[PDB]
């Protein structure tokens, strides 16, 4: 029951009531043994911004997944071009402070991210509910039924959280070590 976004937006806005569930019935607790309704601090008690929290978590997990993949892969293969060669930028963490500025690439990526995020800012502020959350209508290969949708949502959430933590210890493991994909000493 994905509730196609056109009819899903009918219940958008900042919901003022409380569903009585965990964080507004969001998929994601869904642990191995039972449900890990984590929320120790209590941000989910702030029920009206629970969809905001889900949107933030999904965006962070997606950016993470991409970033972990994008500091794992370049340590093996680089983009054709002298500025990206293994000799011009010896390490992947150097790639940030290697192009920047007037070299072009990183500034272009920042510019396009800014454009695509400004264009999708109307999705976060307004047109954001419990069900929509991170739904940017890129479903396509989103399986039908209902439990399959829950399984794919929890897969996305677990992979995103795992990638956030992994990227954290990865940029950390590379600054203190300066090594390829296995960032052990």
């Amino acid at each position: 029951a994905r509730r196609e976004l056109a009819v899903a937006y009918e219940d958008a806005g900042i919901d003022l009531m409380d569903n009585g569930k965990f964080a507004q019935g969001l998929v994601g607790a869904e642990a191995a043994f039972g449900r890990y309704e984590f929320d120790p601090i209590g941000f989910s008690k702030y029920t009206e911004l629970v969809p905001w929290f889900r949107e933030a978590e999904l965006k962070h997990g997606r950016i993470a997944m991409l970033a972990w993949l994008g500091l794992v892969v370049p340590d093996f293969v680089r983009i054709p071009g002298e500025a990206y060669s293994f000799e011009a930028v010896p390490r992947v963490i150097d790639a940030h402070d290697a192009l920047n500025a007037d070299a072009g690439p990183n500034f272009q990526i920042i510019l396009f991210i800014s454009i695509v995020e400004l264009c999708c800012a109307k999705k976060v502020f307004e047109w954001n509910s419990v069900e929509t959350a991170g739904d940017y209508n890129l479903t396509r290969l989103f399986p039908e039924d209902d439990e399959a949708q829950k399984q794919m949502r929890i897969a996305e959430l677990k992979n995103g959280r795992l990638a956030m933590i992994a990227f954290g210890g990865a940029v950390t493991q590379a600054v203190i070590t300066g090594k390829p994909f296995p960032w052990t000493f």
């Binding site: 396509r140 290969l141 039908e144």
Partner: protein, 160 residues
């Protein structure tokens, strides 16, 4: 879930995993569209890999300014970096048009390989069942072959 093409004498339903869970009408729609299009691309790429050797490579210029006589560039890896980027752009633009002239979303004729090309039809004698099973099986073989020659090229360094 068997009758809509893809079934032939060597094996009717070959899927240990992937579609293992069965059902999933939309999932099979997208998977069948992917299989058909992948088979078409693999057929074209295999033919473009055999033509430079079975047939004389194009004696023209490809890039008249840069003199790309079609023989200096190889067949396989490297030719991606050898064909000019301003020509790869037009190749990808033809791909872009052929994948955006008609729809390809769920419920559309696009997720069937139906893009209004026809030509190699039959007389509508329901032997188009045979022709479309040929589509699927021939594309499966062509894709096994296309990645096989991909590897062959990469591991041997050059075309073979």
């Amino acid at each position: 879930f068997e009758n809509e093409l893809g079934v032939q004498a060597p094996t009717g339903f070959w899927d240990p995993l992937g579609f293992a869970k069965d059902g999933s009408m939309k999932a099979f729609k997208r998977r069948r569209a992917s299989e058909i299009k992948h088979g078409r691309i693999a057929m074209l790429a295999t033919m473009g890999y055999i033509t430079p050797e079975l047939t004389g490579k194009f004696p023209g210029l490809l890039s008249p300014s840069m003199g790309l006589k079609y023989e200096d560039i190889p067949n396989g890896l490297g030719a991606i970096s050898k064909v000019p980027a301003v020509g790869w752009a037009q190749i990808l633009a033809y791909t872009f048009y052929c994948e955006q002239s008609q729809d390809q979303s769920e419920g559309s004729a696009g997720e069937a390989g139906d893009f209004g090309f026809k030509v190699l039809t039959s007389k509508d004698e329901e032997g188009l069942k045979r022709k479309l099973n040929s589509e699927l099986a021939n594309g499966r073989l062509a894709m096994m072959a296309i990645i096989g020659m991909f590897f062959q090229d990469g591991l041997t360094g050059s075309a073979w």
